[PDB]
Amino acid sequence: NVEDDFSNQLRAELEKHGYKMETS
Amino acid sequence: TRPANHRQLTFEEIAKSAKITVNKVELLVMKALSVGLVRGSIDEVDKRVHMTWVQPRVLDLQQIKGMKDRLELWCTDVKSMELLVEHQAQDILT
């Protein structure tokens, strides 16, 4: 389809760290 | 009367006609399913009686008239269908 892999690795690690602070 | 054409009927009319309570009318009706005088279920989730089959009371003149006109409609149906089945797969049928 579209190339989900390039985008997910960078997004998953980074976003998750901010999300930790933001929400449980 | 009502079961035949469409299966279900309300149980509320039958209890009031009995003039005896709801908790004891069910009892006789269950006994009737058991012997096989009538077949079907009592659904108390909606308080209606769903009859699968009804006994035809015997030696009544009126009932014979009733079945005859129905039977003629079935006969038509067989003929109508039979022309279609032969139309397609006629090459195969020979």
Binding site: - | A4, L61, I64, M67, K68, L71, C75, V78, E82, I92
Partner: protein, 288 residues
């Protein structure tokens, strides 16, 4: 005497054949009259295989019931004679020559019980009709009636089938200008069976229907059986529902095609060359 000892009835092609012939053979006695014969065959077997039949003189009135003639002599001489050749074959009973079951039949049956060790009523519908079978089997049952007098003699139907020995089947093919008809076979036959079923169903419904008109007005009795059957149709209310399909058929022919082509490639050289040879071949043959 034994009539109750038969669940299933099987008939050879011979019996169906034999009856039509007997009708003429007696000196052409028919119309109102019928022709009966003996049935020879097995008994003490749950399956009744009727082996043969041979002609018997008979005059029937089926519009009266206080006159019939039945040849006494033939039955007895024939049962006595037959033991030496076949100890199992005994007089199995008698065939009635249509058009349907009568109450007129109980009377004739009774005599046959006395004479013959066994009897059975096989009803062959008249002179040759139909693609399928025209025989029905009946056994005389004794029942109580809860409104009249206990011990009444009536006829209850039993399953009718066919069946015959190997040599006989082989004979049928030789004589005949085909082999047999439909009951189920090939891809074509199954579909015919479906169409055969509809014309057949339709006939059964007419019997009931014409009867009701006659019971309502013209005062034929009201029986619990007829009424029970009719009511059920309305009650059961069948509901159309999913399933039963497959798509496999295409892959198989495709697979076979690749191989079929390799064969045509080798074939081509010979097939192509042969065409010329044929025209010339005809000239040579005529010359020499």
């Amino acid at each position: 005497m034994p009539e109750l000892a038969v669940q299933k009835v099987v008939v050879h092609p011979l019996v169906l054949l034999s009856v039509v012939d007997h009708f003429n053979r007696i000196g052409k006695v028919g119309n109102q009259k019928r022709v009966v014969g003996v049935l020879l065959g097995s008994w003490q077997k749950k399956v009744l295989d009727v082996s043969n039949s041979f002609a018997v003189p008979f005059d029937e009135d089926d519009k009266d019931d206080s006159v019939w003639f039945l040849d006494h002599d033939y039955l007895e001489n024939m049962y006595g004679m037959f033991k030496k050749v076949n100890a199992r074959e005994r007089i199995v009973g008698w065939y009635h020559t249509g058009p349907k079951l009568h109450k007129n039949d109980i009377a004739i049956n009774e005599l046959m019980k006395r004479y013959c060790p066994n009897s059975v009523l096989v009803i062959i519908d008249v002179k040759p009709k139909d693609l399928g079978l025209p025989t029905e089997a009946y056994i005389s049952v004794e029942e109580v009636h809860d409104d009249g007098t206990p011990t009444s003699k009536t006829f209850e139907h039993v399953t009718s089938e066919i069946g015959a020995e190997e040599a006989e089947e082989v004979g049928v093919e030789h004589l005949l200008r085909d082999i047999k008809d439909t009951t189920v076979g090939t891809l074509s036959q199954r579909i015919t069976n479906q169409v055969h079923g509809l014309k057949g169903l339709n006939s059964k419904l007419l019997d009931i229907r014409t009867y009701l008109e006659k019971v309502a007005s013209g005062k034929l009795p009201i029986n619990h059986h007829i009424i029970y059957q009719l009511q059920d149709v309305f009650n059961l209310l069948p509901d159309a529902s999913l399933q039963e399909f497959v798509k496999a058929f295409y892959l198989k022919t495709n697979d076979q095609m690749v191989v079929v082509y390799l064969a045509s490639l080798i074939r081509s050289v010979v097939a192509l060359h042969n065409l010329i040879n044929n025209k010339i071949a005809n000239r040579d043959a005529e010359k020499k």
